[PDB]
Amino acid sequence: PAATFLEHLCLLIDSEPVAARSTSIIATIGPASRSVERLKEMIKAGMNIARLNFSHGSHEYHAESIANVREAVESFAGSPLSYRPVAIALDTKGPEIRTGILESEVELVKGSQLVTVDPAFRTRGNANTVWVDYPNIVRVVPVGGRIYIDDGLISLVVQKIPELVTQVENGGVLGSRKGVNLPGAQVDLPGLSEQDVRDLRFGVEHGVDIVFASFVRKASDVAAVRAALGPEGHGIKIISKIENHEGVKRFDEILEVSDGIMVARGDLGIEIPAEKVFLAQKMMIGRCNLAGKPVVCATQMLESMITKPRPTRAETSDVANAVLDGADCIMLSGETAKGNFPVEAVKMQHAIAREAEAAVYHRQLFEELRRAAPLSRDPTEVTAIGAVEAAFKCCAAAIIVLTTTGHSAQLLSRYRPRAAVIAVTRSAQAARQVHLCRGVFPLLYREPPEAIWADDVDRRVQFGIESGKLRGFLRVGDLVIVVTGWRPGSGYTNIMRVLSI
Amino acid sequence: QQQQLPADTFLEHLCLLDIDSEPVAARSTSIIATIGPASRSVERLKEMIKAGMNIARLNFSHGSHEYHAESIANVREAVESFAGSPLSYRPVAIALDTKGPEIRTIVELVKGSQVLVTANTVWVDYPNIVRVVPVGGRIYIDDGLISLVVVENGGVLGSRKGVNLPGAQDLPGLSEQDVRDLRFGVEHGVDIVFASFVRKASDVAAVRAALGPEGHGIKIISKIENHEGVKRFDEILEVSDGIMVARGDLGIEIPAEKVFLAQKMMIGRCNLAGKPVVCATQMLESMITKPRPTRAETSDVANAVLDGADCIMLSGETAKGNFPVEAVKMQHAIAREAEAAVYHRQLFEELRRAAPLSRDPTEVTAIGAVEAAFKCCAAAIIVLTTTGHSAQLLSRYRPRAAVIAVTRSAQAARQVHLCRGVFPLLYREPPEAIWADDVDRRVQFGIESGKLRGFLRVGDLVIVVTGWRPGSGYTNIMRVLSI
Amino acid sequence: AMADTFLEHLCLLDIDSEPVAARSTSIIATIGPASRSVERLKEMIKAGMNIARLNFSHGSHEYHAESIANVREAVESFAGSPLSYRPVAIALDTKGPEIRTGILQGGPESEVELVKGSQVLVTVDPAFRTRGNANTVWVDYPNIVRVVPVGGRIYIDDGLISLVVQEGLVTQVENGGVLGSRKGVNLPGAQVDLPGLSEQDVRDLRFGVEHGVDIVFASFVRKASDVAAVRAALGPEGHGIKIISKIENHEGVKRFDEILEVSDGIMVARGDLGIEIPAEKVFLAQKMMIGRCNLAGKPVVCATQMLESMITKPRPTRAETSDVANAVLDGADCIMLSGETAKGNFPVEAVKMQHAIAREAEAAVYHRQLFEELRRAAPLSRDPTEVTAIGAVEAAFKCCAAAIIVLTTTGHSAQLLSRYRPRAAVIAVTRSAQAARQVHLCRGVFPLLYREPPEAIWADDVDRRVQFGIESGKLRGFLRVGDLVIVVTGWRPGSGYTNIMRVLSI
Amino acid sequence: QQQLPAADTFLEHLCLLDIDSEPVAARSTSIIATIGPASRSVERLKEMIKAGMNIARLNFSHGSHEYHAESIANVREAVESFAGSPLSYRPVAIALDTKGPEIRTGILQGGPESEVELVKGSQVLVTVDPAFRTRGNANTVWVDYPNIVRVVPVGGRIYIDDGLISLVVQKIGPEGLVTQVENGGVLGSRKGVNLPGAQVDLPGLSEQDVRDLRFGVEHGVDIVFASFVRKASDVAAVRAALGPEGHGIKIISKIENHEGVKRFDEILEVSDGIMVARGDLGIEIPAEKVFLAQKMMIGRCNLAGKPVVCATQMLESMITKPRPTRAETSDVANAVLDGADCIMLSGETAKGNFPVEAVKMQHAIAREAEAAVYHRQLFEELRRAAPLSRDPTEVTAIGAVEAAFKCCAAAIIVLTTTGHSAQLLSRYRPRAAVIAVTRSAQAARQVHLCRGVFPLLYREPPEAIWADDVDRRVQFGIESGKLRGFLRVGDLVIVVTGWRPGSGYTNIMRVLSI
Ligand SMILES: O=P(O)(O)OC[C@H]1O[C@](O)(COP(=O)(O)O)[C@@H](O)[C@@H]1O
Ligand SMILES: O=P(O)(O)OC[C@H]1O[C@](O)(COP(=O)(O)O)[C@@H](O)[C@@H]1O
Ligand SMILES: [K+]
Ligand SMILES: [Mn+2]
Ligand SMILES: [Mn+2]
Ligand SMILES: [Mn+2]
């Protein structure tokens, strides 16, 4: 029915979704969700990627978090057909600026007159004193320069710049060690601080699967993340976070060099006017779709759930619209790191996505994507679009790719099939990183290779099919599109066959 | 370029939204703000008008008759304070929001504990409750944040809060209080009735009947707030002047995951029929407490504009919060950016295509005017309208150029805010002897108000729409004039 | 016409769907022996001729003065009823730089047969200009032996005779056949350097102005400067004359875009064009130019061999029927007749056929796609006239307007409306007799010459003209009671001030 | 090349047709040529093959059984003369064109190759009287359909010779029709007559037609163009007559009159494809309307994915002159641009003085026209319209086409047993050539019925190991491909094949580089 655009819309509430939701969900790990038991709960509810937010907590503290995710995850390895892998994502600290330690709450008051970088004063913070961890602030913020504290809920205007006389423009309840922002001011603060490099090495050492790299402003920024990531970490997927004007202006350059993007609406939402983020968001998602790289929508999607068990009408709506925009993943932060309803937040994102996903007008979408996408000569894309097409023609229940590094699956999702892309792979990491791609569902294949190749292929396909039935992707009578390669290894995907279940 | 000038597809389109492309243009989506303690003061009202309020909502769920007579007295007072300058005067509509069949509750409720409906005792003003909630029947309290199975979800309960009984069905659309309320409305010349809990054609019939003879002029916007309302939408729409997607109630009556569908569907259908549609509730909540909205709220506003909504609302945000003006400014600012992001191309084509042939000279002139507008990047379309009807016809098609509507009907100049992209001008002079001349004076009036407010500058082309003889229903001419 | 796609569209063409509507592609007929008679002309006017073509490749000045005298005479024979009077334009077709064979050996009407596989000499020799035989033809383009290489083709007589170059050029007869006196010679792939404007051409053009022809079809136009000359020659007395450039060879095709910019319109001269370039390729040339012209909003004419067999037979072949329809469906503003009406035994019948095919093809147009497509492609504009025009078209579609009635002084406003291809008829009222003629060059326009002297009060003059259009409208069966009509007019008298659109009921 | 710059719209598209854009690619519209005195000679046939003929039409309106057995003997002989190199052998179909319920005048008075003039305003007599079978003259035409005198009423019109001659019947009578000539002209022997508006009780299948059809089977013709098809049941008969020995024969229904046009949808469903017989059609219905009939049927055929043939007078003047008129050139192109799968030649190759030259021209026009198709719109349009399907073969097919577009595939190489898979591919109108490899000689012939398919007959005996047999065939296709200039080093090709041997198991698409 619902599947013009107007027309489409007009035909969208009792049409029960039916299908693996495909927008994968990223949840940040924190006190509210570090416990193996809680993690297991969140896995059941639909978390696919676990975010470690390195703005907080020590190395040891995160090694615990990983230890636990890994623990919660493997607790299901008891049935290979049902095992959901889970990716792990290191979110980098980058050039944050932050206030000192005071869970007491100093009230900064509208109009009252001091930002200091004096070591001694590094905890002497008061109703009239706030100290900040970026010495250069006193040199980069001119008279009538605006300073923001805590998610931009606090505003100060610089009025006298020896030791920053500011006046509180927007006051509020200030807490411990909070994000500071200096828009219109050029931060010479480096993309890669020593801590960031340590943090990244840690990452590799512990085999995280994805680096969400904060404050990416330019191609060279992701180069560093790569260098730091070092040789041991070429497999790591680097997702550039876009969080400020420059990032937005150099987006095209950033996208080219990165594996994907995150629309970091939090910072972005203070660095540029609030009325504008939507544009930035819808724009980068578009461009990303066009290039066929993962894009992540983030921050405050479900805030009030930090405190309440139900989201607001806007948050529901936000989630839907991100999916309808084309986002590959959606995220949770405060919602799962500190709040009183982490599992319930995950369940909600899972539920909205499934409805939003059923409302996509693939028609327009696939045509649009086909149309825009330039010719290509790489057999893999060729097979991929070929597969998608066959998939539409017959309402394929699913497309089952054999993939070594996920790259073939990615190519399929690029074109947004409606049929599920069931990816079979022996690379445990690949099976994790692929959650970065809308509509892909990884299956980790454990058996050792058969002697005769073909047979190995057949075993894997049949493996996918079997896991398929078990999980209710495919039922007898369905047609399935199978995509595979002429010889073993990666980069040789080149075959599409049409099989009946 | 500006206003998102820099496509052939929607994808393409999206890919070219630019963040430095300064919006430039009267925002079109009109803003509704609910009046309450945070905003009943003449001075505060003046502030909100400057920020962009166009409709004032009186929420009859709360406060007495006298208390609202005060609010109207004030809105009127704030508004007329600008009548010092006819070229600049912004009318403001007044909308009565009906109480309808609510259920309400003068401590923390703990998860797992028993709570009796009549710390563990809550009394309710719907007696039939004990008769319609069976064993396993869910009872929700306060904005659906508190849950009760005949306590599932705990939380802080306050005094007299919304109660909902989903899956359960009897309470009349029109209670005696509602009728009094409506009479009050007519008596005080409200311009619009947002009618709560509309579930079926006959429901709006009553609102009309109650509204009585003295109130045929009153526009009746039906609030959709529950399953039934959603299922009978097509019938309700036919009979109503337009719609409100009441996401609050709706968002408890049906699963939360689903409202977006309801919303995008109704807005589509309304667009199709050319009736105003209003998006409402929680668009900017956190601003009830904080001076800045969350990234989701920003996003919500834009997407309602981009969905097609004619008006967007504010409730807690302007009735009780600490940042009413600041909430209005925000809606105004989002709308303007979302409006420059509309892909009129697809939109107009889509509307044209879908709209059936017609034979009414007015529609004919209208679509023609729009088309001319596009061809030249008209700065604006200037209609002379008696009841607004011709301005409405123009907006139907979603010109990008502004629809400047000149009218002597003060009320029409108000009710027209219900229509995306229209900008009313109330014309005060007495008629000229020679007709034509009267026409010319009005057009020129519109033009002059036009320059003054920065809709049109020298060199612009404007599309003028008028009628062959005086009275309504005779719109039938389109002229192309240069400024 | 209400289908969502072109495929769909096609699939719903109905053979019992009687056309109903003024055909809109105007027809151009060449005047010759078969059609110089006032009586025959009157017949052809009734049948639907709109433009009369005088082919200056043939006959003397006196001979054409007679043709014009006659057309004018046939035409004015109907001035007895202003409401019905069909103007008819007159078009001078230029001789330009031809190349021709001689007078056959002892015979200004006799026939030599050129045999397949035989040797033939082509000479440039003054003496031989009359000495044409079975192994010998002479030609009046001396440079030929210098521009045609070994293994180069020479086509003779409409391209029906063919020579390959293997004091004179040694040629094998590729394609043989019966050759007569003084016939056209073509050298494809070869470059010609003969002037666009020969002395004769200039005299011819002056003649044109002198006699008030309305249109110059200018032959062999290869480049912007070529139309400049035609304009210069046309002289001051002739600014009003519309110059339609004829595209007839490779160069013309390659410089099309420049030619188009400088011309009032185009003719796809498929005859010459169809020898200068390979035959397989003309369709491309034709469909391309018509597209481009549509885009620019200038008249484009499709011409030559549309109905040949009718020169001899009373019924066209299945291909010719097909050719006509496709030309209309391509977007051509006018279609032409030549041999068909100049010499053949069925001139009137040929005109009737073009009139009949066009009407069906016109009802098969998928305006939807067309108007959208035109809208879409047309750039913004700021000229009140275009603005009013597209606005009028749009209103027209919305209500299935029976017609659009423009008041136009130089035809310009009517042209703008047709640019967008309304389905409703464009009824143009004008006092300029010449404009009322030249407008036929614009698909879907129907001119009405208004004769009354101006009223004192302006407005009233306007009202009289509109009402004039209406009345002529009912009388001719364009509009009936109950119809809506879209009226386009101006705020003050003069040209270039069109700026109002009203919607009126009949 | 291939009109690559020629775009977001159709208008745009048109505006970019470039005359120096040399076509480059097998032409895909196959060409049908009627065999006749001008072209029965083995040598002439060989010439026509080289020029591009793909299907040979035997017109059973004329000549005896023996005369056609000769024509077939010859085509076959011309064709097999090239079997000397399997990589370049062009199969050629053979099509029996049925006589059906035609009506005809007699031989002319002692003038077999003579003529009579029928004069405007005079009295002609139509006689069914056998005695005057051959006694025709300026005032007398005898006709071979007896009932004519019981079916053409007073005031009823009779057309003779391609509609160029016209009689109005004014007096009915005990020995024939007393006509007044409404259109006159030079009449020849045994020419077709049409009774429009007058309904012809003449059977679709006359005894002769049945014999004719049996002959067909007996001699293994590949295609029956069935004349005057008016209704589903008409093709049933052709099938019945065709008998068991002839299920393989493709039956193309000729649409030649009003009824045919009105029942088209029913006829299409039951037939393997269609011919728009514009000759008859063009007299039975007004001439101004044929174009509509033609564009409509071709559209519908495209939609259903059945071959559609455009026919009659496409190049007439070439019967007499070595060069076609500007309209005929144009007619050919528009038929291809309309979507026609095959184009035909009749007079042009049966009798005229330039049969080869006529074939060459159609070949040359088609190639240019084929580079002008706006596949974009076309494939979208086809996709869009085509309903979901569940048959692996269609699925593979559309998918192959799509891959083809994505990379500008030089070709699609299918392995097909009965041609079915190749047909499914053309259905979607790829731009890339559909090279079909098959061991069925017949299939290789019948596939010419399908736009853009180029059959290759594979001769080697099967390999022991399947797969290897597959690989040999693909490689066979490739090799024939390079040799004929379809594919060059560096190209991508899309290969379509099956999981097991036999027909109906096509289900794999691979992407290979050359
Ligand atoms: O990592 P990629 O580039 O997606 O490769 C997918 C690969 O998976 C396969 O289907 C099977 O790979 P393996 O047998 O090496 O595990 C290959 O044919 C193909 O190269
Ligand atoms: O209110 P509506 O229905 O849009 O009517 C618009 C009317 O405005 C006019 O332009 C002027 O009306 P008035 O002179 O009464 O103000 C009329 O021509 C037309 O009928
Ligand atoms: K000439
Ligand atoms: Mn951030
Ligand atoms: Mn409510
Ligand atoms: Mn010429």
PDB file of C-alpha atoms and ligand atoms in Angstrom, chain A residues 380 401-411 424-427 430 453 456-457 460 483-495, ligand 1:
ATOM      1  CA  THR A 380      31.626  -6.460  -6.666  1.00  0.00           C
ATOM      2  CA  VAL A 401      26.479 -12.770   1.086  1.00  0.00           C
ATOM      3  CA  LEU A 402      29.673 -14.633   1.880  1.00  0.00           C
ATOM      4  CA  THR A 403      32.063 -11.923   2.985  1.00  0.00           C
ATOM      5  CA  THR A 404      35.616 -11.914   4.340  1.00  0.00           C
ATOM      6  CA  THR A 405      35.985  -8.275   5.448  1.00  0.00           C
ATOM      7  CA  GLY A 406      32.363  -7.229   5.224  1.00  0.00           C
ATOM      8  CA  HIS A 407      33.074  -5.198   2.100  1.00  0.00           C
ATOM      9  CA  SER A 408      30.584  -7.139  -0.034  1.00  0.00           C
ATOM     10  CA  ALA A 409      27.843  -6.754   2.519  1.00  0.00           C
ATOM     11  CA  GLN A 410      28.515  -3.080   2.639  1.00  0.00           C
ATOM     12  CA  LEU A 411      28.142  -2.734  -1.079  1.00  0.00           C
ATOM     13  CA  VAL A 424      28.302 -14.954   6.552  1.00  0.00           C
ATOM     14  CA  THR A 425      31.903 -14.510   7.609  1.00  0.00           C
ATOM     15  CA  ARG A 426      34.683 -16.252   9.590  1.00  0.00           C
ATOM     16  CA  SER A 427      36.144 -12.940  10.671  1.00  0.00           C
ATOM     17  CA  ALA A 430      34.119  -8.247  10.421  1.00  0.00           C
ATOM     18  CA  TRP A 453      36.281 -25.321  -1.986  1.00  0.00           C
ATOM     19  CA  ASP A 456      32.952 -24.922   1.813  1.00  0.00           C
ATOM     20  CA  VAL A 457      30.896 -22.346   0.006  1.00  0.00           C
ATOM     21  CA  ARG A 460      28.361 -21.437   4.467  1.00  0.00           C
ATOM     22  CA  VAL A 483      25.984 -13.650  -3.524  1.00  0.00           C
ATOM     23  CA  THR A 484      29.465 -15.338  -3.507  1.00  0.00           C
ATOM     24  CA  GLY A 485      32.904 -15.455  -5.161  1.00  0.00           C
ATOM     25  CA  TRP A 486      34.634 -17.467  -7.852  1.00  0.00           C
ATOM     26  CA  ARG A 487      37.739 -18.175  -5.705  1.00  0.00           C
ATOM     27  CA  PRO A 488      38.647 -17.837  -1.992  1.00  0.00           C
ATOM     28  CA  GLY A 489      39.918 -14.578  -0.461  1.00  0.00           C
ATOM     29  CA  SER A 490      38.484 -11.106  -0.416  1.00  0.00           C
ATOM     30  CA  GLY A 491      37.696  -8.860  -3.429  1.00  0.00           C
ATOM     31  CA  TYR A 492      36.463 -11.618  -5.724  1.00  0.00           C
ATOM     32  CA  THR A 493      32.719 -11.482  -5.022  1.00  0.00           C
ATOM     33  CA  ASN A 494      31.185 -11.970  -8.434  1.00  0.00           C
ATOM     34  CA  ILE A 495      28.213 -14.283  -8.611  1.00  0.00           C
TER      35      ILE A 495
HETATM   36  O1  LIG E   1      35.873  -9.301   1.974  1.00  0.00           O
HETATM   37  P1  LIG E   1      35.121  -9.257   0.665  1.00  0.00           P
HETATM   38  O2  LIG E   1      35.840  -8.307  -0.246  1.00  0.00           O
HETATM   39  O3  LIG E   1      33.684  -8.881   0.852  1.00  0.00           O
HETATM   40  O4  LIG E   1      35.154 -10.711   0.036  1.00  0.00           O
HETATM   41  C1  LIG E   1      34.000 -11.563   0.018  1.00  0.00           C
HETATM   42  C2  LIG E   1      34.648 -12.919  -0.233  1.00  0.00           C
HETATM   43  O5  LIG E   1      33.900 -13.981   0.348  1.00  0.00           O
HETATM   44  C3  LIG E   1      33.945 -15.139  -0.482  1.00  0.00           C
HETATM   45  O6  LIG E   1      32.607 -15.386  -0.987  1.00  0.00           O
HETATM   46  C4  LIG E   1      34.386 -16.353   0.344  1.00  0.00           C
HETATM   47  O7  LIG E   1      35.573 -16.055   1.061  1.00  0.00           O
HETATM   48  P2  LIG E   1      36.471 -17.228   1.826  1.00  0.00           P
HETATM   49  O8  LIG E   1      36.200 -18.611   1.257  1.00  0.00           O
HETATM   50  O9  LIG E   1      37.950 -16.865   1.624  1.00  0.00           O
HETATM   51  O10 LIG E   1      36.115 -17.216   3.327  1.00  0.00           O
HETATM   52  C5  LIG E   1      34.894 -14.793  -1.633  1.00  0.00           C
HETATM   53  O11 LIG E   1      34.471 -15.316  -2.858  1.00  0.00           O
HETATM   54  C6  LIG E   1      34.882 -13.286  -1.699  1.00  0.00           C
HETATM   55  O12 LIG E   1      36.125 -12.829  -2.178  1.00  0.00           O
END
